[PDB]
């Protein structure tokens, strides 16, 4: 099972809202090259590679672990879509 899946299901009123939040956050992380993450450097997901221990490239894994921390705000009609995309690009250049 995914880590903290019970806690993930408990933070949303509909289980499909959790999937939407995770998937939308994952593409936000992919779009900005994981530079918009709310995870501390000791909290970043990692994978074991022969060369060494490196960052996890799976943004779905990152998105699920970010939601467990509680630093992400999700909901409907939070901010305008155009304003959200433009502002993230400015403060997280890519």
């Amino acid at each position: 099972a995914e880590p903290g899946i019970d806690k993930l299901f408990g933070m949303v009123d509909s289980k499909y809202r959790l999937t939407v939040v995770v998937a939308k956050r994952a593409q936000q992380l992919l779009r900005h090259g994981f530079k918009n993450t709310v995870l501390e450097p000791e909290e970043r997901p990692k994978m074991q590679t022969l060369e060494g221990l490196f960052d996890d490239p799976n943004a779905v894994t990152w998105a699920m672990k970010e939601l467990l921390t509680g630093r992400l705000v999700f909901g409907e009609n939070l901010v305008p879509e155009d304003r959200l995309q433009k502002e993230m690009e400015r403060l997280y250049p890519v």
């Binding site: 289980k15 499909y16 998937a23 593409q27 992919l30």
Partner: protein, 1114 residues
């Protein structure tokens, strides 16, 4: 290794030739060896005498005799050149000018008749084929009760299939009898008057039953003349046609009285006489002689129907599923029927050709066009449902295929019309059709197998042999007799005790019309020959069949066909006695024709010096690829100078060991769970099996390529393939073909071919690319043949056929064809399917090292670990008894023959186990070893489970466990014993044709469909997996909306989406939003082709263009 034989029943007669259903029937149809003047009126000889003579009405074309020439090519040549093994057919015909009185005779070439091989198969277009026998309702007269209304019966007259209309006689509620022809119901009184019957004749014959005759005495038409009554009937049958006497008589004669169009058949005529108690002169419902119609069958049919309705004791209804009412059409009859159809088409062409064009100067060669005859024959042997690709995985597979009985095919049945009655085991299948052998699924009860002792008679009815019993003594007189004749006698069981020939038991189990009864010896009239006659060949190869449930015995017999030949194949330790006969009758092995001495022995051929002195050389089939890809080779089993008797084995065939059928290996089996690797039918094997090459099979794959004529220039098969290095061309010879003996892997070139590129200007990016590098574009492109993914092996044969070669009939436009044979030696691996004869099947899920497998106290590890949980629900206890008998034979060094239902019982197995314990444990005592501490612990638990008697010595308790088939088994991982004794023995396990190597397939992107633009299907086409409706339902239930939309659009038929998705992924990007599927665009355009205006709208009902403006006219 001696063989111990069990059983008490003495079989008076041996098994009949197992392929005589194929071989004898086709010999009777061809009649190629009998001289023409002694040919009987059957087979294709009957076809000639039926269509001929052809009369113009004063030119007559008469048939005198026919002959079959020698085949143009041998069987091996036809297979290699993709030809049909056939014999030319010549008919000696004479043309008679009735006006002049002059006869001219010449022999015309009617075409080629395909020939049956010695084993009973055909080579059609270079491929081995088997004509499956067909079962259907026998022709004749039948009397079934009306289901809608009780107390009423209907008469059914059935001719040969496609040889006349089915006729129904029914007593209407009004009292008048009705005749239904071609879905047209009409009163039989009208037709009965046409055949010359008055009012007194009907009353004198049918007036002794009751009120039934009163409904057959309508005088409104009795006073009418037969001639106009014939015209009156002609109006009812086909209404509207102008009433003419000449046209009316032809239609009625052609319907019930024409032997050329109506044929009741030899079986149908015999059934009609037997049932109605009459004697038919021919095989038609009536005769047309002296310008008038005479009755043949209608009056006896109506007489029987009236008597049946009245309730006379001698009349009874007919069971249409009774095997006396069902007959078999063998290969000879099926070919003859299609030969007759082609001959009728040829006769019609002759008739239309002989009525115009140089009437005075005509010859039979000019009139006869044999193409319609050849077309019907070619169609039957190529595109018929009953003409099937020969199943030759192993010799037993081919033997079964020739004995298969199918209710489907042309003139038979379709699943929809096949209900629980044609699919069921009728009581008359006993001894004639195997009750258990049938394909589970949609074909259950529709495809069956002939019983081992059963044979099909001339009329097509299956007969089974019985021993005559008179005065209580069983004689050696064997009578082959049909189901309808079997119902007249009390037939005892083959297991009835006999003191010599006298029946010993006072109470005898017998059958009376299929019902089990207990009778006295003096009431017994016939006896079963053996228990083997009830079952087919495949079922007779299952030892301890009486201990297996029928559902699991079905699986075991079927999977024996799927077993692949092994390089070290072994005959089973426990046999039934038919292993030798299967090999002998399959013609896969080689035997000495008579007594002699072997002169030369080689892997390619054997030369034997017979007593008469003639030198006979037998070439050995070596590494031949079967239809299923299995390697079929014959290995010599004799030495130079060895004296051989008549029938002695010379060379073992595929899947045979010293003349005994060898479909698998004899391995040590432990019945115990193992760490979940036995979960749900999974099988654990030892690595020691791979070390000594058990379950290792040779498979050959064929790859073909053609060099074609093209409008841009001809394709060239050459080693000079542009834009490839020397490494890719390393294994190709100077001619462009891979060298023989080279190891090929996926992506390797088997043969190099260059095709001229289509004239098309390149994209500007490519043009700059070539401009930068200064490389001129060539005129040819790589179209070479490469190894498909997941395949490969060793190149063992290259076949190159070129245009103009003798016997090579290439298609037009093909200059040459190259065929490459690649052989791979397949070892047993994870995912390969193993099975035994008792229906226990499973895939190899784990291969363990030898030190990990459970082992005997003497250090012998087991080979296979089987889950005991597969036994109780499947109720197949024969594997357990085989394991117990195999354990005894493993230590006694002997094999066993236990016939089904009469063989080794537990007292006999346990006494063998007692002897096997004296070598199992007595050897240990001599070596100076007592009882293991670990064995003592197991015995302590064993007495707590009630498996051994308390108070006995450990040796005695170990013997008690051994008599139960259980031994103390040690765990190779820990060294500690298994806490309970484990059933360990030697069992025969087969390696099936379903292998994970040929079934694993994957695809990212590949070919797409032409119209729907969706991925193709199949591993051969590198296609995708079908995501059907139920799989779509699963994603809908999960709520996986985006996952579903990808499969619908991005991964199947969104042309823009799938191109963008692939490009996004290879750039490290996420796939874009999908678009409309191309299949929906196809649906809209197809709906528009149906004059339907289908338009997609938006929130405001405005039209939305999903075609990107490509279908909008300005």
């Amino acid at each position: 290794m001696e063989i111990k034989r069990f059983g008490r029943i003495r079989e008076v007669i041996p098994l009949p030739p197992l392929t005589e259903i194929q071989v004898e029937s086709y010999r009777r149809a061809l009649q190629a060896d009998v001289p023409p003047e002694k040919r009987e009126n059957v087979g294709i000889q009957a076809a000639f005498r039926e269509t001929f003579p052809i009369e113009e009405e004063g030119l007559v074309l008469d048939f005198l005799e026919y002959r079959l020439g020698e085949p143009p090519f041998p069987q091996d040549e036809c297979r290699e050149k993709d030809l049909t093994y056939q014999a030319p057919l010549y008919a000696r015909l004479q043309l008679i000018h009735k006006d002049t009185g002059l006869i001219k005779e010449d022999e015309v070439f009617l075409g080629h008749i395909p020939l049956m091989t010695e084993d009973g198969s055909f080579i059609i277009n270079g491929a081995d084929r088997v004509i499956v026998s067909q079962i259907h309702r026998s022709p004749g007269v039948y009397f079934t009760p009306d289901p809608a209304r009780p107390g009423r019966y209907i008469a059914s007259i059935i001719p040969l299939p496609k040889r006349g209309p089915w006729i129904d006689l029914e007593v209407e509620p009004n009292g008048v009898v009705s005749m239904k022809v071609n879905k047209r119901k009409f009163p039989l009184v009208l037709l009965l008057r046409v055949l010359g019957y008055d009012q007194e004749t009907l009353a004198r014959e049918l007036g002794a039953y009751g009120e039934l005759v009163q409904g057959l005495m309508d005088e409104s038409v009795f006073a009418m003349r037969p001639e106009e009554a014939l015209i009156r009937l002609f109006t009812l049958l086909r209404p509207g046609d102008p009433p003419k006497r000449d046209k009316a008589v032809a239609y009625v004669y052609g319907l019930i009285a024409d032997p050329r169009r109506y044929d009741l058949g030899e079986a149908g005529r015999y059934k009609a006489e037997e049932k109605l108690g009459i004697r038919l002169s021919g095989r038609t419902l009536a005769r047309f002689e002296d310008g008038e119609f005479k009755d043949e069958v209608f009056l006896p049919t109506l007489r029987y129907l009236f008597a049946l309705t009245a309730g006379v004791p001698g009349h009874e209804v007919d069971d249409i599923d009774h095997l006396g009412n069902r007959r078999i059409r063998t290969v000879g009859e099926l070919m003859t029927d299609q030969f007759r159809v082609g001959l009728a088409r040829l006769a019609r062409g002759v008739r239309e050709r002989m009525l115009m064009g140089s009437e005075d100067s005509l010859t039979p060669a000019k009139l006869v066009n044999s193409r319609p005859l050849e077309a019907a024959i070619r169609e039957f042997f190529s595109r018929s449902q009953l003409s099937q690709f020969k199943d030759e995985t192993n010799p037993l597979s081919s033997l079964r295929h020739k004995r298969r009985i199918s209710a489907l095919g042309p003139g038979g049945l379709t699943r929809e019309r096949a209900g629980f009655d044609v699919r069921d085991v009728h009581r008359t299948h006993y001894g004639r059709i195997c009750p258990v052998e049938t394909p589970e699924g949609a074909n259950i009860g529709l495809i069956t197998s002939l019983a081992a002792y059963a044979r099909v008679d001339e009329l097509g009815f299956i007969r089974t042999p019985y021993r005559r019993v008179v005065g209580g003594v069983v004689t050696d007189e064997v009578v082959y007799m049909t189901a309808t004749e079997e119902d007249r006698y009390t037939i005892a069981q083959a297991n009835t005790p006999l003191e010599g020939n006298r029946i010993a038991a006072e109470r005898v189990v017998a059958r009376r019309k299929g019902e089990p009864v207990i009778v006295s010896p003096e009431e017994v009239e016939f006896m079963d020959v053996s228990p083997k006659q009830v079952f087919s060949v495949n079922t007779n190869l299952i030892p301890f069949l009486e201990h297996d449930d029928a559902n699991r015995a079905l699986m075991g017999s079927n999977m024996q066909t799927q077993a692949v030949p092994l390089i070290r194949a072994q005959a089973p330790v426990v046999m039934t006695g038919l292993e030798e006969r299967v090999v002998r009758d399959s013609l896969a092995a080689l035997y000495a024709e008579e007594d002699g001495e072997v002169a030369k022995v080689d892997g390619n051929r054997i030369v034997v010096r017979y007593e008469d002195g003639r030198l006979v050389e037998y070439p050995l089939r070596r590494f031949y690829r079967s239809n299923q890809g299995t390697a079929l080779d014959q290995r010599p089993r004799v030495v130079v100078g060895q004296r051989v008797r008549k029938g002695d084995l010379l060379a073992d065939g595929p899947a045979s060991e010293n003349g005994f059928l060898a479909l698998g290996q004899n391995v040590l089996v432990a019945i115990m769970p193992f760490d979940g690797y036995n979960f749900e039918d999974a099988i654990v094997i030892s690595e020691e099996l791979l070390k000594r090459d058990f379950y290792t099979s040779i498979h050959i794959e064929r790859y073909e390529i053609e060099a074609r004529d093209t409008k841009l220039g001809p394709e060239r098969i050459t080693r000079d393939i542009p834009h490839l290095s020397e490494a890719a061309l390393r294994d190709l010879d100077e001619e462009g073909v891979v060298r023989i003996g080279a190891e090929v892997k996926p992506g390797d070139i088997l043969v190099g071919r260059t095709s001229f590129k289509g004239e098309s200007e390149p994209t500007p990016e490519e043009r700059l690319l070539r401009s930068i590098f200064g490389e001129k574009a060539r005129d040819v492109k790589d179209t070479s043949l490469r190894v498909p993914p997941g395949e490969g092996g060793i190149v063992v044969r290259t076949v190159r056929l070129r245009r103009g070669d003798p016997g090579v009939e290439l298609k037009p436009g093909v200059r040459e064809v190259v065929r490459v044979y690649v052989a791979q030696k397949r070892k047993l691996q994870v995912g390969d399917k193993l099975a035994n004869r008792h229906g226990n099947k499973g895939v190899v899920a784990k291969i363990l090292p030898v030190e990990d497998m459970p082992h005997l106290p003497d250090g012998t590890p087991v080979d296979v670990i089987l889950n005991p949980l597969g036994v109780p629900s499947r109720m197949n206890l024969g594997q357990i008894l085989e394991t117990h008998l195999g354990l005894a034979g493993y230590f006694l060094g002997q094999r066993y023959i236990s016939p089904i239902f009469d063989g080794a019982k537990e007292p006999e197995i346990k006494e063998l186990l007692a002897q096997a314990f004296e070598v199992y444990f007595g050897k240990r005592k001599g070596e100076g070893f007592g009882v293991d501490k670990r064995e003592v612990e197991v015995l302590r638990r064993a007495e707590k489970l009630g498996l051994v008697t308390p108070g006995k010595t450990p040796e005695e308790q170990l013997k008690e466990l051994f008599l139960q088939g259980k031994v103390v088994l040690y765990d190779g991982r820990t060294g500690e014993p298994i806490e309970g004794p484990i059933v360990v023995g030697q069992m025969f396990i087969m390696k099936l044709y379903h292998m994970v190597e040929d079934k694993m397939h994957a695809r990212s992107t590949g070919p797409y469909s032409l119209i729907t633009q969706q991925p193709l299907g199949g591993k051969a086409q590198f296609g995708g997996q079908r995501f059907g409706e139920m799989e779509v339902w699963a994603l809908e239930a999960y709520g996986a909306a985006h996952t579903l939309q990808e499969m619908l659009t991005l991964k199947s038929d969104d042309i823009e989406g799938r191109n963008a998705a692939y490009e996004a992924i290879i750039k490290g990007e996420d796939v874009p939003e999908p678009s409309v599927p191309e299949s929906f665009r196809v649906l809209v355009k197809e709906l528009q082709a149906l004059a339907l205006d289908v338009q997609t709208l938006d929130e405001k009902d405005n039209p939305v263009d999903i075609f990107e403006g490509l279908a909008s006219k300005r």
